């Protein structure tokens, strides 16, 4: 179990760790988060009490280094940083735990929610999306735009998601215009899964990473990307059975975890109705369709 210590908490802020969150008052004696499960990526994220604009945060993996948070009063935000001095870090953390100034990552033992949301999200793969190679952790916020969004403006601060575009030469083989547009199996299986992604696990990870940035930061381009990667599979007539089964599980937990009050902006009515009711895979998403109909029947 790993620890992300905080130097201090000078401004009132709501702190998230994965799907948990807690309020820290201005200059409250708070020095971090302890008992973080090893083996998963994690996101630690922030919304200032003053300016609910800009949710922001840090993707990280505690196996990749010792990380802490420190408020920067010039840039005005909580910054993740890496401590290279191992003995200095253990010494810092042990003192803060002795004085009990840390919140415990509160995992219930029956609960596989985080694993289920992150099964295929790696930290090294996450670095391909967020280019800032000098850090082992990745910064994301509400307003960052995607590579495809800039095509339609700062490239250093972009989300490099896989560009998916159903009306593109990449998606459409010359001479198969109708076939490829109505049955996207060629674009799923050859272009994306065999050409850019290699296996069906990498494909799922980008899709999962897209969802979590949408949910935690309200990042709109990530929401577009999630729905695109779902639609590409639902609109393919030929999808390996194992990928469909896994897809239904993936989506099931995404829908389960989504804040009830955010469904109106995070869920695309058109994509979901098409996927569940019209697409080739309309009968292949039993768990996802059951939870969507019981929890968000309005959308449908």
């Amino acid at each position: 179990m790993n620890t992300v210590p905080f130097t201090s908490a000078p401004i009132e802020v709501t702190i998230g760790i994965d799907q948990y969150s807690f309020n820290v008052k201005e200059n409250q004696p708070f020095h971090g988060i302890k008992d973080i499960p090893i083996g998963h990526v994690h996101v630690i994220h922030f919304q200032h009490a003053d300016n609910s604009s800009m949710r922001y945060g840090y993707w990280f993996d505690c196996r990749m280094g010792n990380f802490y948070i420190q408020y920067d009063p010039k840039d005005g935000l909580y910054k993740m940083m890496e401590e290279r001095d191992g003995a200095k870090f253990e010494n810092i953390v042990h003192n803060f735990k002795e004085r009990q100034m840390m919140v415990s990552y509160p995992k219930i033992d029956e609960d596989d929610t985080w694993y289920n949301l992150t099964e295929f999200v790696q930290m090294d793969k996450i670095r391909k999306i967020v280019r800032k190679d000098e850090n082992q952790f990745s910064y994301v916020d509400s307003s960052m735009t995607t590579v495809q969004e800039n095509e339609l403006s700062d490239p250093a601060h972009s989300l490099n998601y896989t560009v998916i575009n159903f009306k593109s030469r990449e998606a459409i083989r010359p001479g198969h215009e109708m076939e490829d547009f109505l049955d996207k199996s060629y674009y799923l299986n050859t272009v994306m899964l065999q050409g850019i992604f290699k296996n069906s696990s990498n494909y799922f990870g980008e899709l999962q990473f897209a969802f979590l940035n949408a949910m935690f930061f309200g990042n709109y381009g990530s929401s577009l990307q999630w729905h695109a990667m779902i639609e590409l599979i639902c609109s393919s007539a030929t999808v390996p059975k194992h990928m469909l089964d896994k897809l239904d599980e993936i989506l099931y937990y995404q829908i389960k975890t989504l804040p009830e009050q955010y469904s109106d902006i995070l869920l695309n009515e058109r994509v979901w109705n098409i996927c569940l009711y019209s697409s080739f895979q309309k009968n292949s998403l039993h768990n996802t369709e059951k939870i969507m109909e019981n929890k968000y029947p309005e959308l449908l």
Binding site: K167, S168, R169, I172, E177, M178, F181
Partner: protein, 237 residues
Amino acid sequence: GAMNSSNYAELFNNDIKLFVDDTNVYRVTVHKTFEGNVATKAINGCIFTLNPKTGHLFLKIIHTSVWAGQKRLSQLAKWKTAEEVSALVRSLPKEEQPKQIIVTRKAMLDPLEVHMLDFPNIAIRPTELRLPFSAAMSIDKLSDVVMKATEPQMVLFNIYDDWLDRISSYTAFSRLTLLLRALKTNEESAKMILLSDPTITIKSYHLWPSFTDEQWITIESQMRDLILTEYGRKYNV
């Protein structure tokens, strides 16, 4: 964006454009089978592709053989239309390729956009106008060449005959649409109007009769009366 009453004059400026109408591409008769079921029998059709500035009409005849052994024909018809329009553009010299293609029905936008991905600088647009181009199979010489075809075939037609020698494209298009609207609302009456007088003939290389200016005005009036009429007969007004 879309084409409507407010930007109507763009049709007659000097940027090449084509209207594409797919209404008559897939045509069937419906009939009863010996077992008392219903079956369709396809008949020949046509794509109506028109330069509104020049009158130049590229009439691609859709021979019934293209449907043989195919499913979901109404949907295939839109993709076949898009494929043939795309082939047409690619066959034209660059300086003759359109800068815009305006589709008369919105279901053609995606089929055509996908077939024209190689031409990113050609704009594919819908329209809010209810253009009567479905009535082009009421023009005897066009209907005749579609029904006689035994194979796929492209026939070039000038839908304005020689009118541009005497009138502007704006007026020529307005005459054409008035004639097509009448033929669509009441074909027999409209055809009666056009041909009542045996002394006015249709030249062998024309579609419509050789009316003088004064006669076209009378004709145009009669078509407007017909259209207002049928609208009463229809709505009881």
